[PDB]
Amino acid sequence: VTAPDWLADAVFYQIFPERFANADPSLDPQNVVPWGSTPTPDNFFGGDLQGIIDHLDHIVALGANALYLTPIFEADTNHRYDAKDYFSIDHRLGTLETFHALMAECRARGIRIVLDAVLNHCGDGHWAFADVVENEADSAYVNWFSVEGFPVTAHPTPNYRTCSGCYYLPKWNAYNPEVRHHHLDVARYWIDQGIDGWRLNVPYFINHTFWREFRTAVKGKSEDLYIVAEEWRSPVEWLQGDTADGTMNYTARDLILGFTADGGIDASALAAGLNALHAEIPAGFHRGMLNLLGSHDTERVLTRHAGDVEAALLSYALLFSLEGAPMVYYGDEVGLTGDNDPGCRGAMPWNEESWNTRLLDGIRTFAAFRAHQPAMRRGRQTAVALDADTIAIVRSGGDERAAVIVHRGEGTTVDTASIPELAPLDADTVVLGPLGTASLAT
Numbered sequence: 001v002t003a004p005d006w007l008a009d010a011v012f013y014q015i016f017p018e019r020f021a022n023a024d025p026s027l028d029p030q031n032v033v034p035w036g037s038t039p040t041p042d043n044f045f046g047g048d049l050q051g052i053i054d055h056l057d058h059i060v061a062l063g064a065n066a067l068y069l070t071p072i073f074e075a076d077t078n079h080r081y082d083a084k085d086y087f088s089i090d091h092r093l094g095t096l097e098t099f100h101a102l103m104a105e106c107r108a109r110g111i112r113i114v115l116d117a118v119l120n121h122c123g124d125g126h127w128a129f130a131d132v133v134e135n136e137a138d139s140a141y142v143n144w145f146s147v148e149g150f151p152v153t154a155h156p157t158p159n160y161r162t163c164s165g166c167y168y169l170p171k172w173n174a175y176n177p178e179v180r181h182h183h184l185d186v187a188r189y190w191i192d193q194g195i196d197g198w199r200l201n202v203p204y205f206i207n208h209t210f211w212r213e214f215r216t217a218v219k220g221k222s223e224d225l226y227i228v229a230e231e232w233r234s235p236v237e238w239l240q241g242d243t244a245d246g247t248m249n250y251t252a253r254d255l256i257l258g259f260t261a262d263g264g265i266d267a268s269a270l271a272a273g274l275n276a277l278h279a280e281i282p283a284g285f286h287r288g289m290l291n292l293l294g295s296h297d298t299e300r301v302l303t304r305h306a307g308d309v310e311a312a313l314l315s316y317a318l319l320f321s322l323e324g325a326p327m328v329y330y331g332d333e334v335g336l337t338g339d340n341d342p343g344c345r346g347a348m349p350w351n352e353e354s355w356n357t358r359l360l361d362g363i364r365t366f367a368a369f370r371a372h373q374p375a376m377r378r379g380r381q382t383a384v385a386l387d388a389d390t391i392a393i394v395r396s397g398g399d400e401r402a403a404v405i406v407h408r409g410e411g412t413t414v415d416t417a418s419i420p421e422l423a424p425l426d427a428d429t430v431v432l433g434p435l436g437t438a439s440l441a442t
């Protein structure tokens with residue numbers, strides 16, 4: 001197949017729901033921490049679904065029209081990849097009624113919602129696993145997991161298969177038809193609650209036979225439901241038409257940040273990598289790629305840039321220029337900082353005096369350009385290096401075209417007429433100042 005058409009016009013906002021906004025005190029756990037606390041793997045801040053509803057104006061003001069939520073099902077941890085019941089929202093987030101309110105408000109605003117499908121593993125608190133821990137070989141669920149022997153032992157190393165050796169993340173046995181039934185049931189159930197797509201967590205830990213069945217199940221509900229795979233290496237395996245519509249585009253993240261933050265990759269090397277990536281992606285799937293600069297699994301963009309806001313803006317300029325759907329990680333738009341998980345999972349500040357408004361306004365501008373220019377959404381991409389510190393991202397439909405020139409040096413001029421991919425813009429000589437960008441259209 002090809003990715004859903006609507007992805008061309010999508011702009012995602014990624015939220016880690018424990019940390020976006022706390023609107024309902026009745027849902028706070030007894031162990032809640034102050035909103036300004038340092039995140040850790042164990043604490044709870046009380047972010048909730050009503051908090052999301054209440055701040056949808058912020059997200060629409062940024063230019064986003066879709067949300068990617070990390071897991072929201074009942075779970076013991078703050079990140080919720082350890083689900084204990086795939087059929088219930090976590091009690092600290094809210095009820096199913098509140099979830100439907102969020103969906104209804106999103107539908108009213110034209111915002112789509114993509115949830116995080118965690119099918120490789122559950123939590124050790126999941127009712128099926130607890131039943132195996134208690135009843136052992138007599139449990140009906142023993143073969144829902146891969147338990148080496150009894151008793152079940154977590155420490156010092158688990159005697160059961162897990163996600164990357166983590167004792168509290170037992171691995172689901174996806175070779176058991178009963179487990180596959182459960183998983184495909186979860187996929188269909190949440191679609192029925194109104195969601196618009198699923199992001200696949202570590203799909204490479206399962207197998208393609210299962211993911212083909214998953215696509216069939218999802219697309220059987222609606223061909224317009226989006227499936228995006230988490231993939232940190234090449235996307236190609238997920239874009240053959242039988243599994244995903246796109247991947248999280250971590251390849252492009254690495255290219256962009258190597259140029260704008262690290263210094264190590266120059267414009268020639270950035271263009272060659274972008275063009276090679278675009279060529280590897282099959283036609284019909286470029287639009288489904290979910291492009292990003294950071295996530296809940298990376299340091300924050302502004303930290304990667306060592307606090308250099310103008311340089312960080314270069315990375316946003318590149319992000320919004322690329323074919324595929326751009327995604328901003330919550331808080332990055334106001335210049336939050338932090339090292340990798342747990343450091344990137346700080347609470348979103350709502351006191352606007354802490355906000356970096358140069359970043360916010362800048363990202364808003366790049367979003368507006370893409371929104372206004374059809375070619376920036378539906379146009380094919382070519383990357384053209386001009387010199388070691390200067391790159392142009394050209395998006396061309398037919399007769400029309402647009403281009404974003406990004407410069408990481410101390411200034412340059414571009415003779416647009418001498419560059420064949422830029423010549424149709426009829427833009428003459430463009431002068432860029434230090435860490436400058438320019439956005440041009442026919």
Ligand SMILES: OC[C@H]1O[C@@H]2OC[C@H]3O[C@H](O[C@H]4[C@H](O)[C@@H](O)[C@@H](OC[C@H]5O[C@H](O[C@H]1[C@H](O)[C@H]2O)[C@H](O)[C@@H](O)[C@@H]5O)O[C@@H]4CO)[C@H](O)[C@@H](O)[C@@H]3O
Pocket residue numbers: 079081118163164165166201202230296297341
């Ligand atoms: O559901 C697991 C995990 O999946 C995504 O991230 C993939 C993840 O892969 C590697 O990390 C592994 C850790 O080294 C290992 O210790 C264990 O960690 C468990 C983690 O569980 C959750 O992580 C999710 C990510 O959020 C997903 O998007 C939780 O959020 C984390 O806080 C825990 O550390 O297993 C993972 C997965 O193999 C990479 O090192 C990591 O960079 C990448 O994020």
Ligand SMILES: [Ca+2]
Pocket residue numbers: 022023024025026027028046047048092
């Ligand atoms: Ca709360």
